[PDB]
Design an enzyme around this catalytic site. Structure first.
Site, PDB file in Angstrom:
ATOM      1  N   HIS A  41      68.954  29.746  55.696  1.00  0.00           N
ATOM      2  CA  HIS A  41      69.998  29.164  54.851  1.00  0.00           C
ATOM      3  C   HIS A  41      70.915  28.343  55.740  1.00  0.00           C
ATOM      4  O   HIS A  41      71.174  28.770  56.867  1.00  0.00           O
ATOM      5  CB  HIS A  41      70.794  30.219  54.109  1.00  0.00           C
ATOM      6  CG  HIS A  41      69.951  31.178  53.322  1.00  0.00           C
ATOM      7  ND1 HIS A  41      69.726  31.051  51.966  1.00  0.00           N
ATOM      8  CD2 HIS A  41      69.225  32.224  53.734  1.00  0.00           C
ATOM      9  CE1 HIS A  41      68.924  32.034  51.557  1.00  0.00           C
ATOM     10  NE2 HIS A  41      68.578  32.728  52.626  1.00  0.00           N
TER      11      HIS A  41
ATOM     12  N   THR B 183      69.415  37.659  48.215  1.00  0.00           N
ATOM     13  CA  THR B 183      70.540  36.735  48.035  1.00  0.00           C
ATOM     14  C   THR B 183      70.268  35.556  47.117  1.00  0.00           C
ATOM     15  O   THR B 183      71.158  34.737  46.946  1.00  0.00           O
ATOM     16  CB  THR B 183      71.046  36.158  49.390  1.00  0.00           C
ATOM     17  OG1 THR B 183      70.019  35.325  49.968  1.00  0.00           O
ATOM     18  CG2 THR B 183      71.471  37.315  50.353  1.00  0.00           C
ATOM     19  N   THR B 184      69.065  35.467  46.537  1.00  0.00           N
ATOM     20  CA  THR B 184      68.751  34.498  45.491  1.00  0.00           C
ATOM     21  C   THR B 184      68.201  35.278  44.295  1.00  0.00           C
ATOM     22  O   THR B 184      67.733  36.430  44.416  1.00  0.00           O
ATOM     23  CB  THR B 184      67.701  33.469  45.949  1.00  0.00           C
ATOM     24  OG1 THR B 184      66.378  34.072  45.921  1.00  0.00           O
ATOM     25  CG2 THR B 184      68.013  32.929  47.302  1.00  0.00           C
TER      26      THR B 184
ATOM     27  N   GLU C 111      75.076  33.044  55.119  1.00  0.00           N
ATOM     28  CA  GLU C 111      75.347  33.827  53.897  1.00  0.00           C
ATOM     29  C   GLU C 111      76.272  34.970  54.240  1.00  0.00           C
ATOM     30  O   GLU C 111      77.366  35.067  53.736  1.00  0.00           O
ATOM     31  CB  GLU C 111      73.986  34.323  53.349  1.00  0.00           C
ATOM     32  CG  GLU C 111      73.057  33.149  52.965  1.00  0.00           C
ATOM     33  CD  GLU C 111      72.156  33.486  51.829  1.00  0.00           C
ATOM     34  OE1 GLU C 111      71.306  34.395  52.000  1.00  0.00           O
ATOM     35  OE2 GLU C 111      72.254  32.800  50.780  1.00  0.00           O
TER      36      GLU C 111
ATOM     37  N   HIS D  84      62.709  32.621  56.599  1.00  0.00           N
ATOM     38  CA  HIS D  84      63.319  31.384  56.141  1.00  0.00           C
ATOM     39  C   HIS D  84      64.740  31.310  56.622  1.00  0.00           C
ATOM     40  O   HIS D  84      65.221  32.257  57.216  1.00  0.00           O
ATOM     41  CB  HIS D  84      63.298  31.282  54.628  1.00  0.00           C
ATOM     42  CG  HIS D  84      64.059  32.374  53.973  1.00  0.00           C
ATOM     43  ND1 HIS D  84      63.476  33.576  53.664  1.00  0.00           N
ATOM     44  CD2 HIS D  84      65.368  32.495  53.663  1.00  0.00           C
ATOM     45  CE1 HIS D  84      64.385  34.390  53.156  1.00  0.00           C
ATOM     46  NE2 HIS D  84      65.539  33.749  53.144  1.00  0.00           N
TER      47      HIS D  84
ATOM     48  N   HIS E 158      66.492  34.712  58.027  1.00  0.00           N
ATOM     49  CA  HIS E 158      66.076  35.940  57.360  1.00  0.00           C
ATOM     50  C   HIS E 158      64.613  36.186  57.586  1.00  0.00           C
ATOM     51  O   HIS E 158      63.777  35.415  57.124  1.00  0.00           O
ATOM     52  CB  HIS E 158      66.337  35.783  55.869  1.00  0.00           C
ATOM     53  CG  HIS E 158      67.782  35.777  55.541  1.00  0.00           C
ATOM     54  ND1 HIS E 158      68.289  35.376  54.310  1.00  0.00           N
ATOM     55  CD2 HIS E 158      68.854  36.215  56.248  1.00  0.00           C
ATOM     56  CE1 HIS E 158      69.604  35.501  54.322  1.00  0.00           C
ATOM     57  NE2 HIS E 158      69.969  36.005  55.485  1.00  0.00           N
TER      58      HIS E 158
ATOM     59  N   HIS F 217      64.104  25.755  47.336  1.00  0.00           N
ATOM     60  CA  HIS F 217      65.342  26.494  47.640  1.00  0.00           C
ATOM     61  C   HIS F 217      65.542  26.628  49.158  1.00  0.00           C
ATOM     62  O   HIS F 217      66.661  26.546  49.621  1.00  0.00           O
ATOM     63  CB  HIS F 217      65.270  27.894  47.017  1.00  0.00           C
ATOM     64  CG  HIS F 217      64.863  27.898  45.577  1.00  0.00           C
ATOM     65  ND1 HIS F 217      65.641  27.337  44.591  1.00  0.00           N
ATOM     66  CD2 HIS F 217      63.762  28.376  44.961  1.00  0.00           C
ATOM     67  CE1 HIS F 217      65.060  27.518  43.422  1.00  0.00           C
ATOM     68  NE2 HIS F 217      63.900  28.116  43.627  1.00  0.00           N
TER      69      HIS F 217
HETATM   70  N1  LIG Z   1      67.452  35.423  51.000  1.00  0.00           N
HETATM   71  S1  LIG Z   1      66.603  36.820  50.958  1.00  0.00           S
HETATM   72  O1  LIG Z   1      67.431  37.855  50.362  1.00  0.00           O
HETATM   73  O2  LIG Z   1      66.040  37.098  52.273  1.00  0.00           O
HETATM   74  C1  LIG Z   1      65.197  36.609  49.882  1.00  0.00           C
HETATM   75  C2  LIG Z   1      65.469  36.180  48.597  1.00  0.00           C
HETATM   76  C3  LIG Z   1      64.479  36.014  47.677  1.00  0.00           C
HETATM   77  C4  LIG Z   1      63.214  36.282  48.084  1.00  0.00           C
HETATM   78  O3  LIG Z   1      62.115  36.180  47.357  1.00  0.00           O
HETATM   79  C5  LIG Z   1      60.935  36.514  48.325  1.00  0.00           C
HETATM   80  N2  LIG Z   1      59.623  36.614  47.917  1.00  0.00           N
HETATM   81  C6  LIG Z   1      58.598  36.595  48.756  1.00  0.00           C
HETATM   82  O4  LIG Z   1      58.720  36.377  49.934  1.00  0.00           O
HETATM   83  C7  LIG Z   1      57.377  36.920  48.007  1.00  0.00           C
HETATM   84  C8  LIG Z   1      56.383  37.538  48.701  1.00  0.00           C
HETATM   85  C9  LIG Z   1      55.218  37.882  48.046  1.00  0.00           C
HETATM   86  C10 LIG Z   1      55.084  37.603  46.710  1.00  0.00           C
HETATM   87  C11 LIG Z   1      56.094  36.977  46.006  1.00  0.00           C
HETATM   88  C12 LIG Z   1      57.255  36.628  46.655  1.00  0.00           C
HETATM   89  N3  LIG Z   1      61.567  36.942  49.539  1.00  0.00           N
HETATM   90  C13 LIG Z   1      62.930  36.707  49.362  1.00  0.00           C
HETATM   91  C14 LIG Z   1      63.917  36.910  50.301  1.00  0.00           C
HETATM   92 ZN   LIG Z   2      67.406  34.437  52.686  1.00  0.00          ZN
END
Ligand SMILES: NS(=O)(=O)c1ccc2oc(NC(=O)c3ccccc3)nc2c1
Ligand SMILES: [Zn+2]
Length: 258
Positions: free
Chosen positions: A94, A196-197, A104, A92, A117, A62
């Site tokens: 987008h 956001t995912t 986003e 990460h 992000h 993703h």
């Molecule tokens: N686009 S977003 O909203 O920043 C976003 C969206 C979805 C996400 O899922 C994770 N999971 C981990 O990092 C994680 C950390 C530890 C264990 C499992 C997962 N962070 C996210 C940030």
């Molecule tokens: Zn993100």
């Protein structure tokens, strides 16, 4: 769960497996700069990344995540709208297929080429998985990217992408300093929202910096050579991995600046 960003599995489909997609505090949103109000109660923002310990970079199918050691208070976000201490776990991006789209959040409906992000979890909940079940469990620091001059602090990331082209590939990624990804000013907007995912959990305090960083065309072009697919599968370029803006509903976006 086979969500993604194509015509058949993209954001308009997500609600079927993840009903909270149509919830009351979904992200991202459009930031109307003329409706957001300066809030003098916001305390100063504190980004303390001096002891950050990066470990690994992962293509998750993703986006790509740069993962940090969060087993102690090594890189933390505090202040601003936040109560307590939020620990850096990963960052990460987008981004788009073209420079005209990719972010986003939008600003007065303007889309930036990309959006960084930096994801942090509230240490009063002990671990990330418990934090995502709380309305105040995460703080995501969002930073817009525009195409212009190169960002030198980004190049170590750009140069490792060749080694994680496809889903499930990771590489060692130690000693990366996330301070090199920040703009000069920490002026921001803030509002309560979501991941956001999928799973789209309504657990995030969003802090979106007003000042974008500049990256070069060559830099972002390398993001776009990544693949959503696994090794040996039909090539689907990892582009346009952004969710569009969602309804604001009963929310107020606050500015840290006059
Ligand atoms: N686009 S977003 O909203 O920043 C976003 C969206 C979805 C996400 O899922 C994770 N999971 C981990 O990092 C994680 C950390 C530890 C264990 C499992 C997962 N962070 C996210 C940030
Ligand atoms: Zn993100």
């Amino acid at each position: 769960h086979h969500w993604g960003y194509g015509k058949h599995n993209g954001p308009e489909h997500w609600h079927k497996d993840f009903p909270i997609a149509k919830g009351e505090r979904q992200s991202p949103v459009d930031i109307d700069t003329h409706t957001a109000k300066y809030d003098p109660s916001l305390k100063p923002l504190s980004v303390s990344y001096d002891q950050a310990t990066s470990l690994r970079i992962l293509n998750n199918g993703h986006a790509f995540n740069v993962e940090f050691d969060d087993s102690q208070d090594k890189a933390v976000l505090k202040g601003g709208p936040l109560d307590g201490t939020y620990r850096l776990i990963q960052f990460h991006f987008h981004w788009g297929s073209l420079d005209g789209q990719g972010s986003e959040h939008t600003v007065d409906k303007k889309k930036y080429a990309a959006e960084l992000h930096l994801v942090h979890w509230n240490t009063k909940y002990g671990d990330f998985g418990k934090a995502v079940q709380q309305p105040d469990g995460l703080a995501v620091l969002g930073i817009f990217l525009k195409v212009g001059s190169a960002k030198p602090g980004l190049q170590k990331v750009v140069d490792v992408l060749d080694s994680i082209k496809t889903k499930g590939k990771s590489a060692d990624f130690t000693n990366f300093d996330p301070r090199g990804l920040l703009p000069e000013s920490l002026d921001y907007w803030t509002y309560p929202g979501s991941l956001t995912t999928p799973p789209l959990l309504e657990c995030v305090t969003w802090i979106v910096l007003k000042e974008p960083i500049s990256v070069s065309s060559e830099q972002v072009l390398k993001f776009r050579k990544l693949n959503f697919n696994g090794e040996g599968e039909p090539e689907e370029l990892m582009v346009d991995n952004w969710r569009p803006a969602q309804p604001l509903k009963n929310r107020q976006i606050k500015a840290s600046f006059k």
